[PDB]
Amino acid sequence: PQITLWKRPLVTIKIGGQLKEALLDTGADDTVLEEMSLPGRWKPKMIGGIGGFIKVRQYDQILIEICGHKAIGTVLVGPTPVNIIGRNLLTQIGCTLNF
Amino acid sequence: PQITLWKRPLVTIKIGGQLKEALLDTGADDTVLEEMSLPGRWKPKMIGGIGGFIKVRQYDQILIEICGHKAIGTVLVGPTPVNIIGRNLLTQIGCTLNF
Ligand SMILES: CC(C)[C@H](NC(=O)[C@H](C)NC(=O)OCc1ccccc1)C(=O)N[C@@H](Cc1ccccc1)[C@@H](O)[C@H](O)[C@H](Cc1ccccc1)NC(=O)[C@@H](NC(=O)[C@H](C)NC(=O)OCc1ccccc1)C(C)C
């Protein structure tokens, strides 16, 4: 798809057998999802943004389907108000910005 | 340009006679710049992100050059660690996401 930016670029993701909406986010280094249960071990991690820093759980080698495109990557889980697809996964699906 | 996402999508902007680097950010509703002096009246505004909220100053009808492309828009100024070009201006320069 070619996605204009008049609205928030939300797409459908499938992760852990569940369907969610997520923002395609060129300003995010990492992928950060709201609280959900993922199978596996994890490491604590801190991420920063506007207004400060949150603690998240890091999971590696997680399968995600982003608009029908499969990617495997590190996914962070924690108290974010919106599901974020960051650059670690955007490069895997061949996502570019064009103007 | 076509911009891949292996690194942070930083571009040159010119604003108020000054040269800066700014992130092209599809996850930002608004454009948010580090502290600088802009001529004109302003309105207080709050914006939110990961880790909380911040107070910013809002300026309207500000001329910005993003990579040689001129746009006029609302620019927010406040304590952000990185200059953000958000969707209000990305639509004006015809910027799309593609995969
Ligand atoms: C998502 C995070 C992982 C991301 N942070 C990172 O990538 C950081 C650098 N990573 C990181 O921490 O790496 C490890 C590390 C460790 C030690 C030291 C340094 C780093 C981030 O917050 N990035 C933001 C920019 C930023 C980065 C660093 C520092 C400061 C700011 C936006 O690009 C990012 O796109 C977010 C994503 C997002 C969207 C929606 C909700 C929450 C988060 N958008 C935003 O924060 C934008 N807000 C919005 O667009 C909101 C949604 N609209 C809004 O506020 O409208 C008015 C409103 C008023 C009242 C109620 C509701 C709305 C903002 C830039 C304009």
Curated annotation (Swiss-Prot), chains A, B:
The active site is at residue 25. Transmembrane segments: none annotated. Residues 1-5, 49-55, 88-99 are annotated as: Dimerization of protease. It comes from the Viruses. Residues 20-89 form the Peptidase A2 domain. Homodimer, whose active site consists of two apposed aspartic acid residues. This is Protease. The gene is gag-pol.
